[PDB]
RNA sequence: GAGCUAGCCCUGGCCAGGGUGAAGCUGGGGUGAGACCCAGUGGAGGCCCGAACCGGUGGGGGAUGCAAACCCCUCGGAUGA
RNA sequence: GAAUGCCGGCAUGAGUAACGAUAAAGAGGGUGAGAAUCCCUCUCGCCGUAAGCCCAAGGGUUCCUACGCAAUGGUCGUCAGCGUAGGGUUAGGCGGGACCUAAGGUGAAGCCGAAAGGCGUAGCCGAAGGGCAGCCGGUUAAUAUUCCGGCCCUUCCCGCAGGUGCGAUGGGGGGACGCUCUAGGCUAGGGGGACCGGAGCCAUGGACGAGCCCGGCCAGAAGCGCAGGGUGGGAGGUAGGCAAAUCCGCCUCCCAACAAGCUCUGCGUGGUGGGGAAGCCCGGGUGACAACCCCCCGAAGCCAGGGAGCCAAGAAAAGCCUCUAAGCACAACCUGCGGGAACCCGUACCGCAAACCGACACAGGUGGGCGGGUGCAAGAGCACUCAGGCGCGCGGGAGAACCCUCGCCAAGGAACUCUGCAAGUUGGCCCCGUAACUUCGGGAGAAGGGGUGCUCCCUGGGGUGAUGAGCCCCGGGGAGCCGCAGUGAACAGGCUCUGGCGACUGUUUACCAAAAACACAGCUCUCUGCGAACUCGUAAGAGGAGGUAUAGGGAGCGACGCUUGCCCGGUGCCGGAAGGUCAAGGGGAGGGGUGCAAGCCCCGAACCGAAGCCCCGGUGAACGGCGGCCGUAACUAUAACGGUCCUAAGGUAGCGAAAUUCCUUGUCGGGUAAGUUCCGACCUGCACGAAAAGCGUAACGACCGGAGCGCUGUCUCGGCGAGGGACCCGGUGAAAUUGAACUGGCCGUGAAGAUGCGGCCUACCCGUGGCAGGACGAAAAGACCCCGUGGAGCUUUACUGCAGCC
RNA sequence: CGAUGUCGGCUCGUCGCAUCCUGGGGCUGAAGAAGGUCCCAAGGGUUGGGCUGUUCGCCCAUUAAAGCGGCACGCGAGCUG
RNA sequence: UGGGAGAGGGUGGUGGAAUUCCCGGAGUAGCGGUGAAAUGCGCAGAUACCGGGAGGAACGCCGAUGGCGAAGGCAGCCACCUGGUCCACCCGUGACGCUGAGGCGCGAAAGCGUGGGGAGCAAACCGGAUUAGAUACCCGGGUAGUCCACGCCCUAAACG
RNA sequence: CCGAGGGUAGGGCCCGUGACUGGGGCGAAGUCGUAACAAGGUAGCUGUACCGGAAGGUGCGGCUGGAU
């Protein structure tokens, strides 16, 4: 659920905040945080390479365990559910009976004080991680690796999941969050359940001030600029686009497909996205 | 009103100084040039 | 050449005083249970008034200037992008 | 002899403007060749959240003293930030380094680039962040947390004593963190005292008095006290913290837990060391054996790493503690104590400024800390005033016009004008009261009105004490008094109705535009399956992102409400293994040159051979587009209806003389005595229209219209007054401009607007204050316009290339 | 074109006369009073407001009358903008 | 107290037929549609047939004139949670009852808001025919919607 | 002191009136089509929604007060 405000300022009329209800711990594990090096969009040359970034709240990066096959068979207790400013989903602190402490992204329905575990043998329960060839067809999954032992890459954002669809040889067929049908190697790991905090999408930032808190500087339309700046620049008065809608770099930006056609993964992608 | 020259000894030494020029091809040419011309000071005087 | 200016990054600092009184919390009323209503508490907000600080609205002066952008009066923001 | 030539020199303007804040001066006494200007005294004014003090930058001797006055100083100068000389800056504890890391920079390994060079995990460098041991007083012409005095402390080395498995660049803990609000107790700071100390005063009508005036503290080891911060203890198990581990983590059992204890800082106290006023006698002496006590106020500072709430979720590394590993366990480490040792650089002075940035001793700009008192509701606001600092480095007169800034005004009251521009009015606080409309918050300080000083009397609660007195805070009710007037000075909204545009707070053309422009939450399209797309780079490498489709890029639109119609023929984009066209290459029928030859060499057809284009289809919150004629109804008028040409299709809803309407001041209605503007309607809309969004919309606006009330020197229509200039005398003394000048009017003429030509008229010579009609006055080799086979920015289905992509 | 500042307004005027008013006249389809039309005449006079940047013009209330033109569409080293 | 029947309601699971799309096979000259046609689809390989896969909605026979509920209304099968109602015994209470202005709750469809889903169907819309014309009835397409959740709307030939 | 009332300011209700605009009633001697009554030539009616010169059409669900 999401929290509304009484309209006691013009911005509070629409602003909505996450209820933060599943949160049980307001501080991060000191051993699992390291400083997030803010870029502002600048690359190693000092040049802006992603526009309109910077000036958001300071953040510490919480180290996330995107492998899990690290610790096959060693169960852990869900010790807490925490806020992570570096991503949309929440994070759960796991205390491994090993004594080690690790963060995973919190699935939907994870309950503090529950057991989870990883391996070929794990039961098919929310929070457990297994290679795909041992998750039953139809079960919804998240934190899916793309290649064996290279780390979880798909279905990591709030509310998202991927669905096992069927086995073919060494591979499984998934429906990714985007509706894409893709093969993924069966030995790739994955974690049963969907990612939590599904109400993330219903947040209403409410004011220009909020975007700024997030490191998002104001976006300025090409239609607002001059010919030296943008294809849509200039015109006396307001002007329609007067050419096919283009990016600041000239390429067209309504419909032009941009994936590389000769990419080797085309062999593994079965059906392009829906919607 | 706030003007253009805002003296600052660290900034001065670190931008125009001897070790700054010596680290780049352009900087050494400045020194080769200013030595060939006979300048009394190859580099701005910074109090340090 | 970014010791002016623009943006970002790292690390510090500053914002008198007053006003408004959101959620929540307690009590009470209410109901089968509730929604909800009243009171107290509470102290929210690109909230209000106004110095510092940041601006530069309108008029006047200045115009070989005090000044190659200043001066006076008035005026905007002032916990926030 | 001319190049608005170049360099230099000297004129003109001219004894003219000006001498840099309108905070302000007067006299006496010294010094001296010389005095408005230097020094000293008295009087006066100005600052006092500074115009006082401290600190960091920056400046670099400007500091102090003697001696000077040519120049510098907007005058003067005997003075000085000026000339000459001499002197002056003292640290284990203050700041930086012999410590740590942040962005960033550099860079073993490694990667990349024609060269030069670009990157790059480790490491190193890098501070105003972390860390770390000094406080009070005195002293010099000039330095002081540095010298000295008193009282504390830190590290290193060596030695002694006790103690312990000692030992690290390695493991762990800690260091270690946001914003807003805030409790308790303290301190800084302050106010009062009828109490303590004090040189003296009694004026001019009264007063020898709870009289006046002055002051009544500072630092301090251990110990103790008060208030706080931090931390559970034991046992056992252990596969994790890239070795080890007794440490840390994880499980379990026992006891203790909001306590206590252990540890840590604050504050008080404290042996001891200091300070010590007014007044008056030449910075010094005395006051004085100074007193050094009580009550109230009270932090934003301290205890601190406190507490609570919230979402935007808030550095690192070392010092420190613990663990062990090699090793070493006659060593080593810890604890106490003692002796020794303790380096380098800075330290003067200015520092909101005459010493810094602005060419100047320049009304400008410059980061942090202290910033007293009284009154006004509060305050860093305002007035005055302490301490402290100033009167702004030209003066003296005069009392015109004119200018600036300021004050008032009879009757009228926006008649002013493009516009109430400007200036009035209003103005704080307390109480009463408050409309349409609304997104239910608002609109709202709406509007409008009442109160406001002082005296006496009764009285309610709170803070501190003790429950009381005293002090201080917040009230209440009566009865009176004065004046033109009680926020009696200063600081402090004019209000309303209605329309346009933009939802809103924000942002902008530094230095002519602050807006209706940009941004903005939000809406939609669209790309991207992760070595993502996209962006920077030749590349390596980076960003995106230590993110993963609830994500990231691109584009338009711009809160919210109700909505967003038709056209896919052209262009774009997407889909389409057919067909058509298609490059190198493949293929080699056939043809040629040459040789006696085998052979060498050259041309060359069908056929095979990609993307692209052509072809088929899809697609509008993709580029874009959205008709013309004739006829017809009980009068006319008009046409629901029929017809016809054209188109890819002919503009829907809603709005419309509009930020769009040419004709136009359309017509009608409203307001007005009168309304090219304004509002409300109509609709033949020159030339609206639905995300270059359409129509509305509460709130908001230094936006731009229109109207009214209040009030006014805006005006009728002007007057007077004030100060600073203008004027006169003394001092200093520019500027642009200038062919030379002995430089009048008219009517003519002249390259067509003549002081300079003709004719006539008028006119003794030379200045000072004023005014601006002329000298086609000055300034700038016209920005407009054109010309030049001049330039540069921008665009595209101009040409031709290139990167990029296929 | 090595610059002759451009609309309107305000201020200050001055001039022409083809005269708006006032003075003097002739003719009248001039009874009177009021007009019409032409002649003489430039001495003086020629209002205040609403609208619009406006010139001009309409409109309101008056008036003896609310004249038309020139002076670089008079006047920006006089102001406005 | 002991029993009964039932598509009453709520939640969560899962079963099969069929439609559509996509993949492979095979095959060729039309299919589809109507009163008759045409648009449309089809040699770029359709329809018909075989296998594989995805997805949504609705549940054939049982099913009846039946059953249930206050009404709206409820229909595959399984479980959980839960409502009303009938019978038999005649055990308990002792008129505790009937109605019901206001109030409160429920309330088909369509419609609304936020999100999701989207096979079939189908307002609007586009084309074909029919027709004197045909903004209709018929045909080929097609967006909301129809479905899920939560919140509204409160209507009806909500009828016996 | 109270006080008729007068003055300022802001509200509530009602009546008359208004450029223009919305439908309604009546008039009929017009134009257009033919929606309903027969199976009214697409059975009708219905709530709602979208649409069309007009009556009206269609979708969704409902009623029979529908001929065969
Ligand atoms: Mg939740
Ligand atoms: Mg809200
Ligand atoms: Mg709220
Ligand atoms: Mg709310
Ligand atoms: Mg709002
Ligand atoms: Mg919340
Ligand atoms: Mg949560
Ligand atoms: Mg760390
Ligand atoms: Mg990181
Ligand atoms: Mg990075
Ligand atoms: Mg770098
Ligand atoms: Mg570089
Ligand atoms: Mg940059
Ligand atoms: Mg970018
Ligand atoms: Mg950026
Ligand atoms: Mg951020
Ligand atoms: Mg989160
Ligand atoms: Mg969220
Ligand atoms: Mg949103
Ligand atoms: Mg955005
Ligand atoms: Mg934008
Ligand atoms: Mg622009
Ligand atoms: Mg550029
Ligand atoms: Mg270009
Ligand atoms: Mg371009
Ligand atoms: Mg353009
Ligand atoms: Mg244009
Ligand atoms: Mg433009
Ligand atoms: Mg235009
Ligand atoms: Mg523009
Ligand atoms: Mg534009
Ligand atoms: Mg615009
Ligand atoms: Mg254009
Ligand atoms: Mg366009
Ligand atoms: Mg175009
Ligand atoms: Mg792949
Ligand atoms: Mg600076
Ligand atoms: Mg300097
Ligand atoms: Mg420096
Ligand atoms: Mg620097
Ligand atoms: Mg250097
Ligand atoms: Mg030199
Ligand atoms: Mg030399
Ligand atoms: Mg140099
Ligand atoms: Mg910081
Ligand atoms: Mg502030
Ligand atoms: Mg309150
Ligand atoms: Mg609370
Ligand atoms: Mg504010
Ligand atoms: Mg405010
Ligand atoms: Mg400024
Ligand atoms: Mg200004
Ligand atoms: Mg003004
Ligand atoms: Mg003025
Ligand atoms: Mg001026
Ligand atoms: Mg100027
Ligand atoms: Mg000023
Ligand atoms: Mg000022
Ligand atoms: Mg002001
Ligand atoms: Mg303010
Ligand atoms: Mg404030
Ligand atoms: Mg505020
Ligand atoms: Mg603000
Ligand atoms: Mg010559
Ligand atoms: Mg010259
Ligand atoms: Mg010259
Ligand atoms: Mg010359
Ligand atoms: Mg010269
Ligand atoms: Mg001469
Ligand atoms: Mg002169
Ligand atoms: Mg001067
Ligand atoms: Mg001057
Ligand atoms: Mg003054
Ligand atoms: Mg004077
Ligand atoms: Mg003198
Ligand atoms: Mg003298
Ligand atoms: Mg003196
Ligand atoms: Mg003061
Ligand atoms: Mg200097
Ligand atoms: Mg000194
Ligand atoms: Mg000196
Ligand atoms: Mg001198
Ligand atoms: Mg001299
Ligand atoms: Mg001399
Ligand atoms: Mg001088
Ligand atoms: Mg000077
Ligand atoms: Mg002398
Ligand atoms: Mg001096
Ligand atoms: Mg000396
Ligand atoms: Mg010392
Ligand atoms: Mg050393
Ligand atoms: Mg280091
Ligand atoms: Mg440091
Ligand atoms: Mg000294
Ligand atoms: Mg000490
Ligand atoms: Mg020990
Ligand atoms: Mg040890
Ligand atoms: Mg260690
Ligand atoms: Mg941390
Ligand atoms: Mg920090
Ligand atoms: Mg804040
Ligand atoms: Mg006080
Ligand atoms: Mg205490
Ligand atoms: Mg172990
Ligand atoms: Mg003394
Ligand atoms: Mg003595
Ligand atoms: Mg004594
Ligand atoms: Mg404060
Ligand atoms: Mg805390
Ligand atoms: Mg959040
Ligand atoms: Mg934190
Ligand atoms: Mg770090
Ligand atoms: Mg050993
Ligand atoms: Mg050394
Ligand atoms: Mg030294
Ligand atoms: Mg010193
Ligand atoms: Mg000074
Ligand atoms: Mg200043
Ligand atoms: Mg300062
Ligand atoms: Mg100087
Ligand atoms: Mg200057
Ligand atoms: Mg200069
Ligand atoms: Mg001076
Ligand atoms: Mg100055
Ligand atoms: Mg003080
Ligand atoms: Mg006051
Ligand atoms: Mg006050
Ligand atoms: Mg103030
Ligand atoms: Mg005082
Ligand atoms: Mg003075
Ligand atoms: Mg002066
Ligand atoms: Mg005079
Ligand atoms: Mg008057
Ligand atoms: Mg008036
Ligand atoms: Mg009046
Ligand atoms: Mg006005
Ligand atoms: Mg006033
Ligand atoms: Mg006032
Ligand atoms: Mg009203
Ligand atoms: Mg008021
Ligand atoms: Mg208002
Ligand atoms: Mg009095
Ligand atoms: Mg007074
Ligand atoms: Mg004053
Ligand atoms: Mg005010
Ligand atoms: Mg209004
Ligand atoms: Mg608008
Ligand atoms: Mg705007
Ligand atoms: Mg705005
Ligand atoms: Mg709006
Ligand atoms: Mg805005
Ligand atoms: Mg603001
Ligand atoms: Mg802008
Ligand atoms: Mg500009
Ligand atoms: Mg500007
Ligand atoms: Mg400029
Ligand atoms: Mg400029
Ligand atoms: Mg501007
Ligand atoms: Mg503005
Ligand atoms: Mg904008
Ligand atoms: Mg929108
Ligand atoms: Mg590039
Ligand atoms: Mg890279
Ligand atoms: Mg990256
Ligand atoms: Mg990265
Ligand atoms: Mg990402
Ligand atoms: Mg907006
Ligand atoms: Mg915008
Ligand atoms: Mg509305
Ligand atoms: Mg149409
Ligand atoms: Mg098209
Ligand atoms: Mg097309
Ligand atoms: Mg085109
Ligand atoms: Mg082909
Ligand atoms: Mg051959
Ligand atoms: Mg659309
Ligand atoms: Mg077109
Ligand atoms: Mg378009
Ligand atoms: Mg049109
Ligand atoms: Mg119109
Ligand atoms: Mg309009
Ligand atoms: Mg138009
Ligand atoms: Mg026109
Ligand atoms: Mg017009
Ligand atoms: Mg016009
Ligand atoms: Mg008109
Ligand atoms: Mg009227
Ligand atoms: Mg107007
Ligand atoms: Mg018309
Ligand atoms: Mg338009
Ligand atoms: Mg546009
Ligand atoms: Mg527009
Ligand atoms: Mg509001
Ligand atoms: Mg505004
Ligand atoms: Mg504005
Ligand atoms: Mg006047
Ligand atoms: Mg006077
Ligand atoms: Mg005067
Ligand atoms: Mg005077
Ligand atoms: Mg005067
Ligand atoms: Mg001569
Ligand atoms: Mg001439
Ligand atoms: Mg002439
Ligand atoms: Mg003459
Ligand atoms: Mg001559
Ligand atoms: Mg002659
Ligand atoms: Mg002559
Ligand atoms: Mg004459
Ligand atoms: Mg003149
Ligand atoms: Mg003059
Ligand atoms: Mg002239
Ligand atoms: Mg002349
Ligand atoms: Mg002239
Ligand atoms: Mg002239
Ligand atoms: Mg000039
Ligand atoms: Mg030239
Ligand atoms: Mg020229
Ligand atoms: Mg020219
Ligand atoms: Mg020029
Ligand atoms: Mg021309
Ligand atoms: Mg040519
Ligand atoms: Mg030529
Ligand atoms: Mg060019
Ligand atoms: Mg590309
Ligand atoms: Mg010219
Ligand atoms: Mg010239
Ligand atoms: Mg000129
Ligand atoms: Mg008669
Ligand atoms: Mg005659
Ligand atoms: Mg006359
Ligand atoms: Mg005359
Ligand atoms: Mg006019
Ligand atoms: Mg004219
Ligand atoms: Mg006109
Ligand atoms: Mg007219
Ligand atoms: Mg009359
Ligand atoms: Mg008359
Ligand atoms: Mg004229
Ligand atoms: Mg003319
Ligand atoms: Mg003309
Ligand atoms: Mg003229
Ligand atoms: Mg003129
Ligand atoms: Mg002018
Ligand atoms: Mg003019
Ligand atoms: Mg003149
Ligand atoms: Mg004007
Ligand atoms: Mg203008
Ligand atoms: Mg049946
Ligand atoms: Mg019985
Ligand atoms: Mg009822
Ligand atoms: Mg319903
Ligand atoms: Mg429904
Ligand atoms: Mg609906
Ligand atoms: Mg579908
Ligand atoms: Mg027809
Ligand atoms: Mg629709
Ligand atoms: Mg919809
Ligand atoms: Mg029935
Ligand atoms: Mg009366
Ligand atoms: Mg019919
Ligand atoms: Mg029918
Ligand atoms: Mg029908
Ligand atoms: Mg029609
Ligand atoms: Mg239809
Ligand atoms: Mg029914």
* Pick from A219, A217, A222, A220: nearest CA to A250: A222
Q: Where are the alpha helices (DSSP H) in chain A?
A: 208-213
CA A222 to chain centre: 29
CB-count burial class (<10 Å; 0-12, 13-18, 19+) for A39 = middle
Please give the Cα distance from A155 to A174 (Å, whole number). 11
User: By what technique were these coordinates determined?
Assistant: X-ray
- Residue B24's φ and ψ, nearest 5 degrees, are -125, 155
Residue A201 CB in 7 A reach of strand F: yes
How many beta carbons lie within 10 A of that of residue A12, not counting itself? 14
User: What residues pair up with A173 in beta bridges, in sequence order?
Assistant: A166, A183
Residue carrying the six token digits 């000036």: A55
- The answer to whether residues A34 and A63 touch, using CB atoms and an 8 Å cutoff, is yes
A39 C-alpha to ligand 239 centroid (Å): 70
How many beta carbons lie within 10 A of that of residue B21, not counting itself? 19
SS3 of chain B: helix, strand, coil, percent, to 5: 55, 0, 45
How many beta carbons lie within 10 A of that of residue A165, not counting itself? 16
CB-count burial class (<10 Å; 0-12, 13-18, 19+) for A190 = buried
CA distances from A8 to A13, A14, A15, A192, A210 (A): 7, 11, 11, 43, 17
* Pick from A137, A127, A115, A165: nearest CA to A271: A165
Please give the Cα distance from A146 to A213 (Å, whole number). 33
Please give the Cα distance from A214 to A57 (Å, whole number). 6
- Largest Cα separation within chain B, whole Å, is 40
User: What residues pair up with A95 in beta bridges, in sequence order?
Assistant: A77, A101
Residue A165 CB in 7 A reach of strand F: yes
Which ligand neighbours the alpha carbon of B14 most closely?
41
């Amino acid at each position: 659920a999401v929290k509304k405000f009484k309209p006691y300022t013009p911005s509070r009329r629409f602003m909505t905040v996450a209820d933060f209800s599943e949160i049980t711990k307001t501080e991060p594990e000191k051993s699992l945080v390291k400083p997030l090096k803010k870029t502002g969009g600048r690359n190693n040359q000092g040049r802006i390479t992603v526009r309109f970034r910077g000036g958001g709240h300071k953040r510490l990066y919480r180290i996330i365990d995107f492998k899990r096959w690290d610790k096959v068979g060693i169960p852990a207790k869900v010790a807490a559910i925490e806020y992570d400013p570096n991503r949309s989903a929440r994070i759960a602190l796991l205390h491994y009976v090993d004594g080690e402490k690790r963060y995973i992204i919190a699935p939907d329905g994870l309950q503090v004080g529950q057991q989870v575990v990883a391996g070929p043998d794990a039961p098919i329960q929310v929070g457990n991680a297994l290679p795909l060839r041992f998750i039953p067809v139809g079960t919804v999954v998240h934190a899916v690796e793309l290649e064996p032992k290279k780390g979880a890459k798909l279905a990591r954002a709030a509310g998202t999941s991927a669905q096992i669809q069927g086995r073919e040889g060494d591979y499984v067929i998934l429906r990714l969050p985007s509706g894409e049908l893709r093969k993924v190697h069966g030995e790739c790991y994955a974690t049963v359940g969907a990612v939590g905090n599904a109400d993330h999408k219903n947040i209403v930032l409410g004011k220009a001030g909020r975007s700024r808190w997030l490191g998002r500087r104001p976006h300025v339309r090409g239609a607002a600029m001059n010919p030296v700046d943008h294809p849509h620049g200039g015109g006396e008065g307001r002007a329609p686009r007067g050419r096919p809608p283009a990016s600041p770099w000239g390429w067209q930006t309504k419909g032009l497909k941009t994936r590389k056609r000769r990419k080797p993964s085309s062999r593994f992608i079965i059906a392009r996205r829906k919607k | 009103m706030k003007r253009t020259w805002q003296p600052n000894r660290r900034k001065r030494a670190k931008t125009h100084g001897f070790r700054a020029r010596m680290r780049t091809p352009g900087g050494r040419k400045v020194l080769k040039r200013r030595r060939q011309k006979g300048r009394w000071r190859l580099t701005p005087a910074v109090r340090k």
